[PDB]
Symmetry: D2
Amino acid sequence: APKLMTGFVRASGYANKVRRVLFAITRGKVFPEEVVKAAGELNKIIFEKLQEMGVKKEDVVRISVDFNIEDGKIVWNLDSLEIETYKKEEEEKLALAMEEVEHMEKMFEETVKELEALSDKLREISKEISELVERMKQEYTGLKLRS
Amino acid sequence: APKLMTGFVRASGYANKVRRVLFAITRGKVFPEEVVKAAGELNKIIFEKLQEMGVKKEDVVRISVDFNIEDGKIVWNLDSLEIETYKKEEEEKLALAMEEVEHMEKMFEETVKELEALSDKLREISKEISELVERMKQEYTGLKLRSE
Amino acid sequence: PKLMTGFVRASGYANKVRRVLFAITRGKVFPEEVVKAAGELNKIIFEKLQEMGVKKEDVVRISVDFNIEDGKIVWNLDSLEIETYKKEEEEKLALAMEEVEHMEKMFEETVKELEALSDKLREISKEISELVERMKQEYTGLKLRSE
Amino acid sequence: APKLMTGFVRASGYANKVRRVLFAITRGKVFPEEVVKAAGELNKIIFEKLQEMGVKKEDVVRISVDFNIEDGKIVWNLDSLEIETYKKEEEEKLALAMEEVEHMEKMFEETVKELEALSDKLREISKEISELVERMKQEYTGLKLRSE
């Protein structure tokens, strides 16, 4: 029985961290659309639960839950889910450390956005090239076309 | 009334040349599907007129037809077609040129072949890379995804 | 100018310093100087860290001022200051940090994958440029790149 | 014995064609700089000779030369140099044909020019990407770097 776990994650972006782990865990087994929908459903549950524990933005949480993959759907036995909670005030040291993790992932996101912009510029060139190579075949040769 | 004319071309690769020229005079107005179809249709009509002339494959020929574009479609009155014939033995000098032409044009194809090989081999990476970026986005960021 | 690492497990403290050094200096110094300066201080730490008897599992905080001077990195060691946290004390913290390490190393594998592709690409590009030229030489009266 | 020959080529184009044929013939045997100098050297020699013959722009020529590769240089027996000329009024039919092959090859170049623009633009992204990858290595990982 496979198991999602987030480990120590600042509440601020617990939502992200479960999904991130969900993609990682189910890679290849399920379609991405399902991964988002599934994590979305759980994330909405752990939110209302987190409020019942009176959790603030700054606190650090922890998440364990079991799920099974069945004909390309992610189903979890919700009662196999457990949340641990850590008030910043109690574990001030850990709680800071977790803002540091957060900020260094926000920093990261800028880098990816850069990369995305390049890979985009590239598939663009790639298309324009491959497109043109054909346009030559047409006008300058008698080779087999793509028609 | 626009028109296609081929220019001096060896009988050997007459079929190719007419298709080459057609794309040219019709870029961005027609579709390749409609062009490749009409270029096969009109060159069959030439071929039956071509055996009718008794013209060999070492010879040289001039082709000029009128044509018209109708809602993306390609249409031509055939009694506008005009084929000139030039026997090898008569212009032994001319025919030798269209043979050297044809050879280098084929020699060119082999280079295009490698280019296509390169273009695709790239477009693979282009796609693998862009897809890896998504895979990163999903696993390592809170960024919006192709998926959502 | 001040590099600080914040909470990092003792094991990958080496990396963290350099990683951040690159970040802070980007553009201002050649990379060769970043590795040299980083390694120089990283040793100075390692030694000064053993004197305090720090295992690999413990967590640490490191702050040192430095100066960019005619393209070189100089730091006054006096400004350097190290906090040290025993796993025994912060069992909760030290886990979180180990958790980061695992994740950071999991990440390395993705990068390697990406490089693998960028390389395969640079190669393909170099070939295409190389071939495009060879076309110009054989089929055009165009100007070449050796005239 | 290696032997560069152009075949039928309009007077205007001779210059290129020989250089093109020299590259194609001596592939991987000599550095391009040598080829372009060598073609450069012969091409001026054949120009002088081409004026003596009184050849106009429109006429067609054929060229043959013997040459040998020595230590990475291209040397030719210049007395092996053999030219033929075909004034337009004599082969009026051939001259027009070689004119069309000229204008065609020029319509071609505008394409290679475009392709080149793309190849470059690409090479650039390759460089930018491949660099971005290194920056990630140094900033986000403890992997081995190009700087160790």
